[PDB]
Design a protein around this motif. Structure first.
Motif: not given
Lengths: 156, 135
Positions: A156, B28, B44, B46-47, B66, B68, B71-74, B89
Motif C-alpha cells: 500500500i 473505512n 490508492g 495499484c499493487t 489491480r 486498492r 478503502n483498499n478493495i480488490e 505498487h
RNA sequence: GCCGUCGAAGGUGGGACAAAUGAUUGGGGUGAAGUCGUAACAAGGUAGCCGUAUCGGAAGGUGCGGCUGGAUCAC
RNA sequence: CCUAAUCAGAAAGCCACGGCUAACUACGUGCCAGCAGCCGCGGUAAUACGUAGGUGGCAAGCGUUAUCCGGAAUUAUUGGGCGUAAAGCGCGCGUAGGCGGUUUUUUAAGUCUGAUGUGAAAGCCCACGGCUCAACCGUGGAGGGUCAUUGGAAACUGGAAAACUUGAGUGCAGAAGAGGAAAGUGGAAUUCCAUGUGUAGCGGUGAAAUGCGCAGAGAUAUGGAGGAACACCAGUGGCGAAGGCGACUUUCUGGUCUGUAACUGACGCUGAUGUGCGAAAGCGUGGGGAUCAAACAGGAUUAGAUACCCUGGUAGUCCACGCCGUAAACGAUGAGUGCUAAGUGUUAGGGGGUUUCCCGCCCCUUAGUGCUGCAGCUAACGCAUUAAGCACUCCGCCUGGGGAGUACGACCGCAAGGUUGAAACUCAAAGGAAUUGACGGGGACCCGCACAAGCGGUGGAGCAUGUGGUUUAAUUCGAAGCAACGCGA
RNA sequence: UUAGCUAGUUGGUAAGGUAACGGCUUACCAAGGCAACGAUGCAUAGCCGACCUGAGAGGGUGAUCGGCCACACUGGAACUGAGACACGGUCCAGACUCCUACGGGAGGCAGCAGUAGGGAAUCUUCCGCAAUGGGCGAAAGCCUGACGGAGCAACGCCGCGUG
C-alpha cells in the motif's frame, strides 16, 4: 486440455526468455462462454513496469500469433505480478520480511483468523512484525503451526 | 390494480443498483465501518499491473492493473491512454468507466495527476488528461 | 462505624448463535508416471415442448404425464 | 462605494466540430497507433488519430466524475399491461374486507357549505423597499391543516327507519348430463401361462451379437391367469373451478339450465390471511405387478459399450394412505356485471304463428360454446355479443436479457427434496410480432442433336500452324473450362 | 427470508413515590395484556419545518437556519440546586492512557481553532465583544470558540471587463 496447455507452456516459455527473458511461473486459463483467459504470470524482475508488460505481451502474442495448436483463438492474459505471494513455505516468509503479510491462524481474534502485519525481522515461526490492527502497533509472534492460511500482502 | 389492493400496497418502483461499486472512504479508516461514500475520487495504489490481449482484427493491446483505493478493495482495472511512467505498487487514481475491452471490470484509471502521468503533446489534454494547458 | 435493599463493573460455570478456522474423512478430476493394457476397427449415429424421475461423468437417452408454441437468414 | 488620472492598454479561457447536438476542411498518420458516451470509426484518404487552419458553443470559467429527479409516463392514480414481447393460482371454499339494487323519510356522520380559532418565523409565490443592478435581505400580501368548532344541506355514500322486487333468495313446472367418489358387471386383449399340434430356428442387424430356442423358441390352435386401461361414440358433446373428467351399471350426493316470479326484501360482490381440491413422476409404508419401464446386464458397436441397435428384465408404473401440490394444470385471456352492427351455428329450453308432432318453419329471447365480420382496439396477430369494444367492485403477477427459479432462509416434506426464494457478475441488448431475400429436393407442363434415328468432326498415320514446355545469343507479348490451342497475329 | 409477543406484565387492592399519573415500584389476589389492519424481531435512522428535480403530480433530500429530541472516555449512581443525575460538577468502577518518589497519583476537543492521523480535501491553533446575546448585579464590569467581523476553498450564484 491440461496436457495441451502445458505443451503451450513449454513452446511459449522459449519466447518469454528470449524476448523479455522473463520466465512464466505458470499459464492458466479461465473461461466464461468465450475465448478463454490464459493468465500467464510472467516473472523476471519483481517490479515489472507496465511497459515491461506491454512489450512482453506484444512478444508473446506475436509468438502465438502463428502458434496455436488449440483450434480456437483465446484471450492472452499477460500477467507481470508483484511480490504479493501466498506464504506456504518458510522461505516465502523469509523473502517477505521487507513487506507486510497477512495470516490466518488456528487462534483467531473475534471469530476470524486473518490478520495483517508489516514485518520488521524474520524469526522462524515467531513473528516480530509491526502488525497493525485497529490502528494498533505491536510485534506479535504469530505461531506458524496456528497459521492455517498465510499470504504476503500488499505494501500500500 | 384494484383501488383497495392499490391501497394495501406501495406500487414499488424498480429502483436500480449503482453498477459502480464506488464505496469511497466513508468509515473505512475508523471501525472499518462500511460506508457508502460517493466520492468522485479516493487515493490508492495499484499493487499489480498487467496486460490482457484483445482479439482480432483490432489488436489494440489493452493493459490492466489491480488496485486498492482508500478503502483498499480488490479490483482488476484496465488502463486507458497512451504513455505512462508508473509500475507495480504505484499510487493511482481510478475513475468510473466501463468500456468495450473486457468484462469483470467497470472502472478506469485517469492520466496526468499521479504515477500514471499523461502526455502533454496533444491539445485535448488542455483541460483534462491531468496535464496542464499545453503551453 | 457495621449489617441489610439494589448495585454497576467484572469474572466464574451450563449451554445457544456462533464467527474464520477447521480434525480427518469424503467427492471429484488426473496421468506425468509405479500396475500393464492391448494393438482390432474404430464407432452400423442420432435427432418437433414443459414438469418429473432413472441412468448416462456428462454430452443425452428410457422415459411417465400430458403437448401449444414463436424453420434459415443476408448485405 | 465614490472622485483626479492610466492605456486598449493588465484581465480569459476552455469544450467541441462524423453525427447524435453547435461547428470542417487541409495535412501527417496508418485497422496499427488508437479514439471511443452511442452508433462505431481509424486499414495508409480520419472533418471519428494526431497536427494546422477554420468554425461553432461557451467563459470566469471549462470539461470529467459521484448522486436525485426530469427524461423516467422506467409505476402505469394522474400516467402499463397479462391475445402473444414480463405477468392469471392449477383450480377452489370462503373470514375480514372492498364496493354496494328500486323507492320513502330523518341524520348530517360524512358529503358539500360558509363562520370561528388555528396553521412559528423565514423560505415559500405576489407586490414592493434597499443595496448601481444583479445577488441579496427586508416589507407586506398571498400561499400555507388531511386540525378542532359551528352555520346551512340531505343529492350522494354512510348510517336510522320504511317497504318494493328480478339480481340474491327461494318458489313451481320441467328440461340436463365422461360431474363426483364408492361399489359391483362385462369385454378385446399387453403380458404370462395351461393343453394340443407343429416345425428350427425366433431373434435384432450392416452382419447380427446377444437374448430366446430344437426337450417344440419363434408358431399354432384349445385353455386360463393376473393386472391393465377400456375398440367405436368422441364433437366447439358434456361436467367441471381446474386438475382432469369417457367400457357398463349402481351408491348418494354435487352441479346444469328452460321456463318460473312464487315474493321475505339486497339478503349481493370478488375475495389478503386462511384454506380444500387436485397430470405424471417420485417416494414412505403395506400388497400387486398385467404390461410398460428406466436404470441394467447379456450385448451389437467398440480397448470401453450399459452409449442404440438388440434380449430379457428392470425401481416403479399398478393396489392403501400419506408424502406428494407439481407441469404445457396454457387461452400466460381472474370473476361477476350489463351495454353494443351483422351474418351465422351449436348445446340443451321455451314460445308464437306457421303445419299432421313446425319435429318439420321461422322468429324472439334463455344460458353457454362456434366460423365471417360493424365499430372498436392490438406493433402486428385477431377478437369482435362468447370482445381482446365499452365501462364497473374484487385477485395475482409482471420492473431488459439473463444471471438464477437458482442461491439462501424458513417451513414443510419419509424422502425426493419441495415450497420458498437471491446476491454478485455480465451484456447492450434480450424479446415480440410482422417484413424482404435465400434454402431445398422429386414429380408433373415443357422445349433443345438432349436424346432416339441416323449424320457429320478429333486423334489411327503423317503433316501446317497454334497452346504449352524445352533450350536459346533471343527463342518477344498478352489468354485461356464451358467463355484456350491459324487467338490478337 | 421479522409472527407470536407476553408477566410488574394486565387490572385492581394497600403502602410508598414523585408535579401529577399509574406497577411507577413494592406486598396482595386475579390472569391477564398485546398478536397479521404486521405486535414482535432485525437493519437503520436524529425529527420536522425545510430543501432539490419535476409543468405539476410526484420523487428525492434533510448543509447551515427555526425549533424539538438524544449524547457528552464507558458504565453505575447520587449531592446540589427551581431546574443537572450536570458538552467544559462530582463519586465509584471499568478500562484507556499518562506519569510518579513506583508506594499511587492524572486525564477524556461528538465545545472552538488547531494538532496527529484519517480522508479528495474542507476555512484562522484570526480578532473582537465595535453589534446584540446572555449569566451576575444597580452598574461599570466578567466571560462570550454565541455571535459580529475580517481570513482562506473561482467552493456557489450574481455582477464589470478581459475592449
Amino acid at each position: 486440455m491440461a496436457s495441451k496447455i502445458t505443451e503451450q507452456v513449454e513452446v511459449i516459455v522459449k519466447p518469454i526468455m528470449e524476448d523479455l527473458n522473463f520466465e512464466l511461473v505458470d499459464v492458466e486459463y479461465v473461461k466464461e462462454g468465450r475465448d478463454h483467459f490464459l493468465r500467464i504470470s510472467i516473472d523476471k524482475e519483481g517490479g515489472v513496469d507496465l511497459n515491461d508488460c506491454t512489450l512482453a505481451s506484444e512478444k508473446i502474442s506475436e509468438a502465438m500469433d502463428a502458434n496455436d495448436p488449440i483450434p480456437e483463438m483465446y484471450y492472452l492474459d499477460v500477467a507481470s505480478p508483484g511480490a504479493e505471494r501466498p506464504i506456504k513455505k518458510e522461505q516465502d516468509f523469509q523473502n517477505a520480511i521487507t513487506k507486510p503479510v497477512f495470516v490466518s491462524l488456528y487462534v483467531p481474534i473475534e471469530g476470524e483468523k486473518e490478520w495483517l502485519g508489516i514485518l520488521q525481522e524474520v524469526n522462524n515461526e515467531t513473528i516480530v512484525v509491526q502488525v497493525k490492527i485497529k490502528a494498533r502497533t505491536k510485534d506479535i509472534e504469530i505461531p506458524r503451526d496456528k497459521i492455517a492460511k498465510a499470504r504476503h500482502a500488499v505494501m500500500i | 390494480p384494484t383501488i383497495n389492493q392499490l391501497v394495501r400496497k406501495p406500487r414499488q418502483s424498480k429502483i436500480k443498483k449503482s453498477d459502480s461499486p464506488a464505496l469511497n472512504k466513508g468509515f473505512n479508516s475508523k471501525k472499518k465501518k462500511f460506508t457508502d461514500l460517493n466520492s468522485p475520487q479516493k487515493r490508492g495504489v495499484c499493487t499489480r499491473v498487467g496486460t490482457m490481449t484483445p482479439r482480432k482484427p483490432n489488436s489494440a493491446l489493452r493493459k490492466y492493473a489491480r488496485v486498492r483505493l482508500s478503502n483498499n478493495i480488490e479490483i482488476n482495472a484496465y488502463i486507458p491512454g497512451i504513455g505512462h511512467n508508473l509500475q507495480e505498487h504505484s499510487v493511482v487514481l481510478v475513475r468510473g468507466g466501463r468500456v468495450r475491452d473486457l468484462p469483470g471490470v467497470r472502472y478506469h484509471i485517469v492520466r496526468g495527476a499521479l504515477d500514471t502521468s499523461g502526455v502533454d503533446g496533444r491539445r485535448q489534454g488542455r483541460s483534462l488528461y491531468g496535464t496542464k494547458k499545453p503551453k
